[PDB]
Predict the structure.
Amino acid sequence: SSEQLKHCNGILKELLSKKHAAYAWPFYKPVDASALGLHDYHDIIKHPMDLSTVKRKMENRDYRDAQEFAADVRLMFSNCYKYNPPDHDVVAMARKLQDVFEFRYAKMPD
Amino acid sequence: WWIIPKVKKGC
């Protein structure tokens, strides 16, 4: 219930914390396709997502259950895996941050 | 930051 959303908010705070900043920083804000020269990004990624958007939704009480929060976080990683070849640093960073997310999300209070 | 966007991190 609200208890499960508190667990989600805790995960979100952890993903944004200094402990994980070395691999989380590419996901703090929406991909700036123009600034990075990725002029095909929005043709390949039709539903962009990032941690600032997840945080805005959490602060506005947008998520009604844990599954909705998890779908957004996982969409963010999915976009990274779709756009970027797996040998690029951003994919290694995404996989490590998703490890953090999945292992803690799995500890959802029942 | 990126040395090369997406490809290689610098920080």
Observations:
- The two ends of chain B are 6 Å apart (CA to CA).
- Strands of chain B lie at 2-4, 8-9.
- The CA atoms of residues 4 and 10 of chain B lie 8 Å apart.
